[PDB]
Amino acid sequence: GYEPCWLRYERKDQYSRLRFEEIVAKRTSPIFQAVVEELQKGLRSMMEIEPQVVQEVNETANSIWLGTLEDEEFERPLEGTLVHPEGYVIRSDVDDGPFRIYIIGKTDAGVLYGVFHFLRLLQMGENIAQLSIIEQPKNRLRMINHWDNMDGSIERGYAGRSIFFVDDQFVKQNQRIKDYARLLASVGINAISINNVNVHKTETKLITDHFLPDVAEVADIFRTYGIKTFLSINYASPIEIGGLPTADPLDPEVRRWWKETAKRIYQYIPDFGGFVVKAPGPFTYGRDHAEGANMLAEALAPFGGLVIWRCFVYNCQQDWRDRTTDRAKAAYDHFKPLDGQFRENVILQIKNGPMDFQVREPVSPLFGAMPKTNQMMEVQITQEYTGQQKHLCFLIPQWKEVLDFDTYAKGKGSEVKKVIDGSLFDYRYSGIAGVSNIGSDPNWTGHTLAQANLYGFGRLAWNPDLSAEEIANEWVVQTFGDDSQVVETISWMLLSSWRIYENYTSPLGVGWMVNPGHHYGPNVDGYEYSHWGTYHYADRDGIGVDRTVATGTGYTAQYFPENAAMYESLDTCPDELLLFFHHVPYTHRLHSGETVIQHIYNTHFEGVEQAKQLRKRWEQLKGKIDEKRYHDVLERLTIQVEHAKEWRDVINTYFYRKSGIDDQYGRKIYR
Amino acid sequence: GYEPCWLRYERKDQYSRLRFEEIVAKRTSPIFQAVVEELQKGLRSMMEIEPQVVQEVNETANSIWLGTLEDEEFERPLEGTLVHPEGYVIRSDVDDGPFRIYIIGKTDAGVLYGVFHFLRLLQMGENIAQLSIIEQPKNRLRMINHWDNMDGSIERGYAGRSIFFVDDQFVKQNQRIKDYARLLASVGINAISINNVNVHKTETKLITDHFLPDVAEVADIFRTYGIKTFLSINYASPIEIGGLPTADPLDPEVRRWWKETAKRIYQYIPDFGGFVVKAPGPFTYGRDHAEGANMLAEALAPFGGLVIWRCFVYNCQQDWRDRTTDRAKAAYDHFKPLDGQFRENVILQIKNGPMDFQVREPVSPLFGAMPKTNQMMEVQITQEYTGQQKHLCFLIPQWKEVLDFDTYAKGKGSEVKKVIDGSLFDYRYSGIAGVSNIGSDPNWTGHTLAQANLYGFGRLAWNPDLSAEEIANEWVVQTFGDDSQVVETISWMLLSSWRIYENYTSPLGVGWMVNPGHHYGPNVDGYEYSHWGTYHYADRDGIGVDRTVATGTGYTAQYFPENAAMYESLDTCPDELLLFFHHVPYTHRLHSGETVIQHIYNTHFEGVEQAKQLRKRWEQLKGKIDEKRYHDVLERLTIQVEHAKEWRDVINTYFYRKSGIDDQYGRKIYR
Ligand SMILES: CO[C@H]1[C@H](O)[C@@H](O)[C@@H](O[C@H]2[C@H](O[C@@H]3CO[C@@H](O)[C@H](O)[C@H]3O)OC[C@@H](O)[C@@H]2O)O[C@@H]1C(=O)O
Ligand SMILES: CO[C@H]1[C@H](O)[C@@H](O)[C@@H](O[C@H]2[C@H](O[C@@H]3CO[C@@H](O)[C@H](O)[C@H]3O)OC[C@@H](O)[C@@H]2O)O[C@@H]1C(=O)O
Incomplete structure (x- = not known):
């Protein structure tokens, strides 16, 4: 019903195959199950081989070994340098006996990304006889934001309708969600918000018992592919569905309402990522964004959740006559003064530019200006102002210009990528998010070549270099x-x-x-x-x-x-x-x-x-x-x-x- | 729940009242019933009197006599000159006995308009001691076009939602429809199309058994107030609801389908006015508008129905680069050549201007250019380009400029009003239509003073002078x-x-x-x-x-x-x-x-x-x-x-x- 995009696993000719008799899966976790199935799928389709899945190495068989550091029966120096949880090492056994490929991850997720890397090498026809690879992602958060509405429409969606919702309900067919998760995981994406940042009537209910079972069902699928699930929330929820008279973040009952809401969500989704927020709101009650973001952060804190606060805030009622007011200055003037006032699990999400995803915009001044506040950049994969997938527009070159822009925050060598990967200011949580360009269209992205933008986003998120x-x-x-x-x-x-x-x-x-x-x-x-x-x-x-x-x-x-x-x-x-x-x-x-x-x-x-x-x-x-x-x-x-x-x-x-x-x-x- | 608009019938002081003991209603038709009730309402509210309704004059009572020429017991010269069916005479008895006011109409409708004229005189505080009035409308068709949709919305509606529809159904409360009919009749409006000229999915079904009972219920109300009901139709109906493979007006089965549709409608509404048409369509099959309009005209002909064909046709896909193409010329170039090819029950409806109801537009060249084709002018009461009822804009002065524009079609004295009233070319059916400016708002028109535009439209429709x-x-x-x-x-x-x-x-x-x-x-x-x-x-x-x-x-x-x-x-x-x-x-x-x-x-x-x-x-x-x-x-x-x-x-x-x-x-x- 839809294309496999870049995971074609096209059958190889007789001169480009590999000889493997077994796949050694050292673990049985849900992620490992998905990892093995993916390896079997790739090898069957490309190599026409079906190695048996075992849990212990056969000394005389050609094998692909899958495991973490603790599963190792020695542990070589290379994998010993791994420090990132999602990192991995891929190396061919240097001995002269059977052929063995070791995919060693720091955690299960690492094994998943390692296997997708191995499969990528096979699709590319690379010689894997003497592999010695070590990979660790630069960005902790490599996220996708969906602007999908529950009526099926997608705000700024040019690739068809939502694959998640229809008729104010979740779609009953989850097979496409699994294939989507596979695509996202193949390029290292580890986080996703499934609903529009502009949270409407029905969507506001995603944080209630009425829809949480469905949200959990979706989260279960993404979890097996190393992806954390997030929900965009309606800041006015306490009023609309909470029955409270206000949404003021300083109101005692409002604070309690959100804490109870968080608790409820985690009972359904133990590893819930947190909330994406577009902000009745803080300003409505004379509160600043630190007070507004911190209240939600406190609700999620006990559970390890994160608050992704969008900095897309400006005067949407500016007078064109007044040339002293500049929308481009808004984000910085609003958040710069608040540096150091945000809770540790709050991440300010800032668009690459200070205006609104135009074909070209200078870099948002906020990057490099808030040493004490986690930041992540938001880019738009859907081509709102860049052709709407009617015109071809590979966005990777532009994103690299932004990522490589030197802010000089700490002198030369203070590129945006160093700001969002957290190395420049030692951010605990930071990274990059991209507004999804997919839809129900058979080719997923409307324009077949737009598939390159989703793939490319993931690649840069993993390694901006x-x-x-x-x-x-x-x-x-x-x-x-x-x-x-x-x-x-x-x-x-x-x-x-x-x-x-x-x-x-x-x-x-x-x-x-x-x-x-x-x-x-x-x-x-x-x-x-x-x-x-x-x-x-x-x-x-x-x-x-x-x-x-x-x-x-x-x-x-x-x-x-x-x-x-x-x-x-x-x-x-x-x-x-x-x-x-x-x-x-x-x-x-x-x-x-x-x-x-x-x-x-x-x-x-x-x-x-x-x-x-x-x-x-x-x-x-x-x-x-x-x-x-x-x-x-x-x-x-x-x-x-x-x-x-x-x-x-x-x-x-x-x-x-x-x-x-x-x-x-x-x-x-x-x- | 809503205002009485201009039919306030405000209580008069003790020095401005009339003495009447009886209302002599010579007929018992549905229209006469509404006429009497209206007179009772006006006299009770304004004069605080409740004359008894009788069917024969009391030689010694002060009375208001209501009847037609045949009901007269003599017939004076004045009413003898009445030739128009909707005309009437109002005269005070010249004798020195009891006070008697005679309202004599050519037909029942004439009595209705005569009574509303009498009530208007009372509201205005005019001396009715020696009345001698004769009135006949200049335009045969004095119509209102509704752009109401069945989901409740009104295209270009700035006065609230539809008073006819809601949730793709007819409203259950018809009292407001009766009061609306009273308002329309008070200013002589005698025809109305209840649905948007842009006929959508559900509205296309108004000509089917599923909705005809409701349409008839509405038509029944309007009939009692001398108003004929019309429906805007979807030219593609044969396909959408007819099950036919085409909508071609020359296709034998399409022609038959419309004839059967007309027959069906008239079984529910014996005096159905006809269809309002915005035109798959004629051009879709290489047919001209005469062929397209005549097919519908033939379906309605046996029943006396009319086809109101809107001439709002132009290239909605013009290239801004091409300065040789002029949208303003479109209507004339399209219809002028077809003069003399339309059936007698087809009326071409043309906007006052050749573009689209702008604050000011010159008069459409079509008026005066088609001696052999019935024409009626369409004006817009709803202020689409004239303030949308936020800005005050009394449209009567503009309409008079259009009506008084001399086309010189037959030399000096060929004003637009003479074209549409049918006197210049002897049109059998012609007149004027206005796009309704009402909605569910309590004041009916959004802007309280916009009530003057609806009232004014009716007055000009009756007498452009x-x-x-x-x-x-x-x-x-x-x-x-x-x-x-x-x-x-x-x-x-x-x-x-x-x-x-x-x-x-x-x-x-x-x-x-x-x-x-x-x-x-x-x-x-x-x-x-x-x-x-x-x-x-x-x-x-x-x-x-x-x-x-x-x-x-x-x-x-x-x-x-x-x-x-x-x-x-x-x-x-x-x-x-x-x-x-x-x-x-x-x-x-x-x-x-x-x-x-x-x-x-x-x-x-x-x-x-x-x-x-x-x-x-x-x-x-x-x-x-x-x-x-x-x-x-x-x-x-x-x-x-x-x-x-x-x-x-x-x-x-x-x-x-x-x-x-x-x-x-x-x-x-x-x-
Ligand atoms: C999901 O939110 C985003 C918007 O789709 C996007 O265009 C942008 O906002 C635009 C603005 O969009 C309008 C927002 O209000 C709606 O009622 C209207 O229909 C939209 O056209 O258009 C003007 C432009 O200056 C803004 O930047 O930002 C969105 C976001 O929240 O990032
Ligand atoms: C009920 O029909 C009328 C239109 O409301 C009115 O504005 C006019 O047409 C306008 C045109 O309106 C667009 C028509 O297509 C719709 O999809 C769109 O939403 C409307 O904005 O706007 C451009 C203008 O040049 C046209 O004259 O004419 C209508 C009519 O049928 O008289």
């Missing part, structure tokens, strides 16, 4: 095979896609210029006079938001001195973010040599030609990809080309109508 | 009393409201500039790059749609020579419609002496000050209006003032940003 090139390579090979043309072509498409999409959408980092509401397609003035604080200020002479300290909102001062100075200066501010930081004349000359207005025309005309090239390159792969997927993607690429033409012309015409400056190259701009 | 001044006077007196200050103040507010709203919204007839979707509030470029064909083409030098023959779309040629020439010339084109017909520089000098850009600034700054005056004048009436209604309206007036400020600033800033020309008077324009 992985290159975009190798992640793309891994995904393409596992999903489409090793034909050099197929690999090179699809890898190029993925690696080039983000820049291509940015080229014909919003210019030089100013963002937006999208249709209000659904957010798909060009509409330069869409939110220009709205109350959302998302303005470009384009007029007949220039464009851009002055965020400088010298003459603007002073947003640049939120960064540490090194980056603040870079953006503050009109001369040093990078072209790609120029309009986010400075208001400049259309004739302003960029580092590229292009005037701002000509840059707009250039990238929009040229971006469409690049999109046409994406389609052309794909068409050249006909015959090397199964017809179904070939046409599924071709269909989307054609949709992309046609819509790109709309983006190009709408933006070019809008700016020609305002600037009065013609295209240097005389290309077609409709009057 | 009535002045806006007298209609406003009638409504105010009946609804708020005769205090000279109250009357003068509210009348001024109503009469000035439309111009005030236009002043701060779209300029010089170009229209739109509203938020997409809900259509409320400023957004200059809202639909500027959309596929709806609603563009203003504003750039850094000028604004406007070139609809001239010389250099534009050639739309002016759709009018007859006299009007075509007026609009074609930049020098003679009226200021109020300039931007709808010409694209001009911001510096273009208007007949008023204002440059186009300064006119924009002037009306927007000044319109807000005028709105503040509306509120000020209302506040001065405190103490002379019951507190509930005083505050209900004050609340709305304050909302209007605050939103007007937004309209003013958004438009002024947009044009300053594009034109670069400052306000002549140095008023505040946000950069």
